[PDB]
Design a protein around this ligand. Structure first.
Ligand SMILES: COc1ccc2c(c1)c(CC(=O)O)c(C)n2C(=O)c1ccc(Cl)cc1
Ligand SMILES: CCCC1C(=O)N2C(N(C)C)=Nc3ccc(C)cc3N2C1=O
Ligand SMILES: CCCCCCCCCCCCCC(=O)O
Ligand SMILES: CCCCCCCCCCCCCC(=O)O
Ligand SMILES: CCCCCCCCCCCCCC(=O)O
Ligand SMILES: CCCCCCCCCCCCCC(=O)O
Ligand SMILES: CCCCCCCCCCCCCC(=O)O
Ligand SMILES: CCCCCCCCCCCCCC(=O)O
Length: 582
C-alpha cells in the first residue's frame, strides 16, 4: 500500500524476507564475501521493521527497486571490485536497474563447490544451523544469478530437511549422501530448464512459445474452456518474457498475480488446484506449476468432427489461422495427456502444412480428408522407441544399459570426445531408470522433460567445441525436429579407427579400491575407447571381450599380489582380444 517494503515483509514473514534479500544480493554482487551480504541483509531487515512499525517513517515510501539500488550503490569497493557496474550508480531509476541487469554474469569464474565429509557437514549443521544454511544459499545463488529466488528458497528447505533427518541417523552417510546427490541433480535440471526456456524464447519466438504452452496447459487443465487457456497462455507468455529479462521483482509479482487469478477461477480451470491455492503466498506459483493433470471430460466428441469432416474448416482457418490451429492443439492435447508436448506440435505442424496446401485446392474437403492417417506414423515412432528402450533396460540393469547406449552412440558419432560420450550416455541411462518405472501412459511425457535438458546440455558443449556437422545439424534444427534428428543418426562409415594405444588398455590394481561410480566410469571409458579403435566390431565380439575383461578384474581383485596379476593377464587379454577383433 503506502510502503512496499512493509507490505512485502508482512506477506513473506521475517524468515523468508531475509532469505530472499540474501539471495537477491548474492545474485548481483557475486564477488562480495559472505559476511558482507549478511550485514546488508540485517540492515535491510532492520529498515523493513521500522516501516512495519510506521508506514510513514523516512524512505518507507520508496519503491523496492529504488531502495534496492540505493543500498547496492552503498558498497564502497563497488568500482574497485566490479569496475563498470559502479557506473550504473550514476544513472537514475529505471536506467539504473536496467544497467544492473546487464552486468549480472550468467556464469562467473568461481571455484567449484566441494562437498565436505558427512561428519564435518553434520557437525557444522548442529553448531550453527543458520549460518550453515545461509552460507550455502549464498554460494549457490552467486553461481546461478538467474535462478528464480523463491525456487532456490524451496531447495534450501529440502536441504535443511535432509540434514535434520540424516545427521541424527545411525549411518549418517547412508542417509545423507543419496539425498544430496538427488538434490544436486534436481537442482541442476531446474536451472538448466530455466536457461533452456529463455534461450528458446529468443530463438524460436513467441508463436512457438504460445504453441508449446497451449499444448502443455491443455493436458493439465483439460476441463478449462479454450478461452481461459488462451487467457492463461497470454499471461504466461508475458511472465516468461519478464522473468527471462532477469528482474526478480517484476518476475515475482507477475507470477503472484497469475497464481491468484488462477486460484480465484479454479473451479473453472482444474479440480486439482485445491491444495496449491491454500498454501502460503510464497509457494503458490511453484505448486501450481507442478500440479497433476485433472481428469479429462468423459463426454468429449471426436476431433474429426470439427477438424476433418466439417465443411467450414478452410473458412474458419483462413479467418484466424493461429486461433484455429490453437484450437486444434487444445482439443488434441487435452485428450492426450500421454503425448509429449513436442509430439503434439509435430501433429499441429502436419495439420498446418496440410491445410495450407489443401485450402488452395479445387475441392479442399477431399484434399485434407485423410490427414489423421498422417498422424499415425508420427505418434508411433516415439512410442516404439520407448518400448524398445524400456524393454532393453528391463533386461540389463542401469549400468549395463548405459554400456549398450555407449556402444550405440560411440558408433554413431566417433568424433565426440570420450568423456563427453560417457557423461551423455550415463545421463540417458538414468532417464531410462527414472521413466521406465511409470506406466505406459506416462512414459513419453517423462522422457521428454528429462531428454530435453540432456539434449540441450549436449548441444551446448558441442557448440563450444564443434566436432561433427551432423550433431550441429540436429542441434540447430527446429525444437520439434531435435530429438528425431538425433534418433536418425546412423553409424559413421567415414570414421577411420583410432590407432592402438597400449596405455589406454592397461589397468592396475588401483581399480579394485575405487568406489563403484568410479570403477564404472573407468571401465566405461575403456569401452568407448575400445569402440573407437575397432568400430566394425559386432555386439557379439564386443560382448565376449567385455566378458573376458569382466572376469579379468573379478579374478585379479580377489587374488594375492594384485599388481602382477593385472600386469600379467593384462598382456593376455589385450593380446587375445586384439586377435578376436582382427
Ligand atoms: C506452459 O508454458 C511452457 C512454455 C514453454 C516450455 C514449457 C512450458 C516447458 C515445461 C513444460 O513442459 O511444461 C518447457 C521445457 N518449455 C520449452 O522448452 C520451450 C519451448 C519453446 C519455446 Cl519458444 C520456449 C521454451
Ligand atoms: C510445468 C508445468 C507447465 C506450467 C504451468 O502449469 N505453469 C503455471 N501455471 C500456474 C499454469 N505458471 C507458471 C509460473 C512460473 C513458471 C516458471 C512456469 C509456469 N507454468 C508452466 O510453465
Ligand atoms: C541450497 C543450499 C542449501 C544448503 C545446504 C547445505 C548442503 C550443500 C552442500 C553440497 C555442496 C557440494 C555440491 C555438491 O552437492 O556436489
Ligand atoms: C527488497 C525486498 C524485496 C524482496 C524481493 C522478494 C519479493 C518477491 C515476493 C515473492 C512472491 C512469490 C510469488 C510466486 O512466485 O508465487
Ligand atoms: C493462441 C494460439 C497460438 C498457437 C498457434 C498454433 C501454432 C502451432 C503450429 C506448430 C508450431 C511449432 C513451432 C515451430 O516449429 O515454429
Ligand atoms: C533411452 C530412453 C529414451 C526414450 C526414447 C525417446 C522418446 C522421446 C520422446 C520425445 C519426443 O517426442 O521426441
Ligand atoms: C553423442 C550422443 C548422441 C545423442 C543421442 C541421444 C538421443 C536420444 C534419442 C533416442 C534414440 O533414438 O537413440
Ligand atoms: C584392445 C584391447 C581390448 C581390451 C580392453 C577391454 C576393455 C573393455 C572394458 C569392459 C567394460 C565392460 C564393463 C563391465 O565389465 O561391466
Amino acid at each position: 500500500h503506502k510502503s512496499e517494503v512493509a507490505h512485502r515483509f508482512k506477506d513473506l514473514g521475517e524468515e523468508n524476507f531475509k532469505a530472499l534479500v540474501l539471495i537477491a544480493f548474492a545474485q548481483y554482487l557475486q564477488q562480495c564475501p559472505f559476511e558482507d551480504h549478511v550485514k546488508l541483509v540485517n540492515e535491510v531487515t532492520e529498515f523493513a521493521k521500522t516501516c512495519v512499525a510506521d508506514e510513514s517513517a523516512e524512505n518507507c515510501d520508496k519503491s523496492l527497486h529504488t531502495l534496492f539500488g540505493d543500498k547496492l550503490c552503498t558498497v564502497a569497493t563497488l568500482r574497485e571490485t566490479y569496475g563498470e557496474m559502479a557506473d550504473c550508480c550514476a544513472k537514475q531509476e529505471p536506467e539504473r536497474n536496467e544497467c544492473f541487469l546487464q552486468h549480472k554474469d550468467d556464469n562467473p569464474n568461481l571455484p567449484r563447490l566441494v562437498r565436505p565429509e558427512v561428519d564435518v557437514m553434520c557437525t557444522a549443521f548442529h553448531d550453527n544451523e543458520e549460518t550453515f544454511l545461509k552460507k550455502y544459499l549464498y554460494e549457490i545463488a552467486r553461481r546461478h544469478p538467474y535462478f528464480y529466488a523463491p525456487e532456490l528458497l524451496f531447495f534450501a528447505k529440502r536441504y535443511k530437511a535432509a540434514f535434520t533427518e540424516c545427521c541424527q541417523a545411525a549411518d549418517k552417510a547412508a542417509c545423507l549422501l543419496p539425498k544430496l546427490d538427488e538434490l544436486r541433480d534436481e537442482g541442476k535440471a531446474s536451472s538448466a530448464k530455466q536457461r533452456l526456456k529463455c534461450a528458446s524464447l529468443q530463438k524460436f519466438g513467441e508463436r512457438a512459445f504460445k504453441a508449446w504452452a497451449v499444448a502443455r496447459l491443455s493436458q493439465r487443465f483439460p476441463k478449462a474452456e479454450f478461452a481461459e487457456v488462451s487467457k492463461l497462455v497470454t499471461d504466461l507468455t508475458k511472465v516468461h518474457t519478464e522473468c527471462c529479462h532477469g528482474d526478480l521483482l517484476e518476475c515475482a509479482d507477475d507470477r503472484a498475480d497469475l497464481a491468484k487469478y488462477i486460484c480465484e477461477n479454479q473451479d473453472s480451470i482444474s479440480s486439482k488446484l485445491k491444495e496449491c491455492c491454500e498454501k502460503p503466498l510464497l509457494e503458490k506459483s511453484h505448486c501450481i506449476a507442478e500440479v497433476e493433470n485433472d481428469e479429462m471430460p468423459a463426454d468429449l466428441p471426436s476431433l474429426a468432427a470439427d477438424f476433418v469432416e466439417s465443411k467450414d474448416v478452410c473458412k474458419n482457418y483462413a479467418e484466424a489461422k493461429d486461433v484455429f490451429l490453437g484450437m486444434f492443439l487444445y482439443e488434441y492435447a487435452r485428450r492426450h495427456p500421454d503425448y509429449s508436448v513436442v509430439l503434439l506440435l509435430r501433429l499441429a505442424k502436419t495439420y498446418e502444412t496440410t491445410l495450407e496446401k489443401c485450402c488452395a485446392a479445387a475441392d479442399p474437403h477431399e484434399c485434407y480428408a485423410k490427414v489423421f492417417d498422417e498422424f499415425k506414423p508420427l505418434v508411433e515412432e516415439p512410442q516404439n522407441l520407448i518400448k524398445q528402450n524400456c524393454e532393453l533396460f528391463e533386461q540389463l540393469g542401469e549400468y549395463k544399459f548405459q554400456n549398450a547406449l555407449l556402444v550405440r552412440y560411440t558408433k554413431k558419432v566417433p568424433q565426440v570426445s570420450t568423456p563427453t560420450l560417457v557423461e551423455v550416455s550415463r545421463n540417458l541411462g538414468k532417464v531410462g531408470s527414472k521413466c521406465c518405472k511409470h506406466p505406459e501412459a506416462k512414459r513419453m511425457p517423462c522422457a521428454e522433460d528429462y531428454l530435453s535438458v540432456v539434449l540441450n546440455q549436449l548441444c551446448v558443449l558441442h557448440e563450444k567445441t564443434p566436432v561433427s556437422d551432423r550433431v550441429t545439424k540436429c542441434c540447430t534444427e527446429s525444437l520439434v525436429n531435435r530429438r528425431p534428428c538425433f534418433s536418425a543418426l546412423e553409424v559413421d562409415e567415414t570414421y577411420v579407427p583410432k590407432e592402438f594405444n597400449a596405455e589406454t588398455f592397461t589397468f592396475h590394481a588401483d581399480i579394485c579400491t575405487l568406489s563403484e561410480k568410479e570403477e564404472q566410469i573407468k571401465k566405461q571409458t575403456a569401452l568407448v575407447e575400445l569402440v573407437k579403435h575397432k568400430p566394425k566390431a559386432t555386439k557379439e565380439q564386443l560382448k565376449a571381450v567385455m566378458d573376458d575383461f569382466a572376469a579379468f578384474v573379478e579374478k585379479c581383485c580377489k587374488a594375492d599380489d594384485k599388481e602382477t596379476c593385472f600386469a600379467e593377464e593384462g598382456k593376455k587379454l589385450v593380446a587375445a582380444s586384439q586377435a578376436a577383433l582382427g
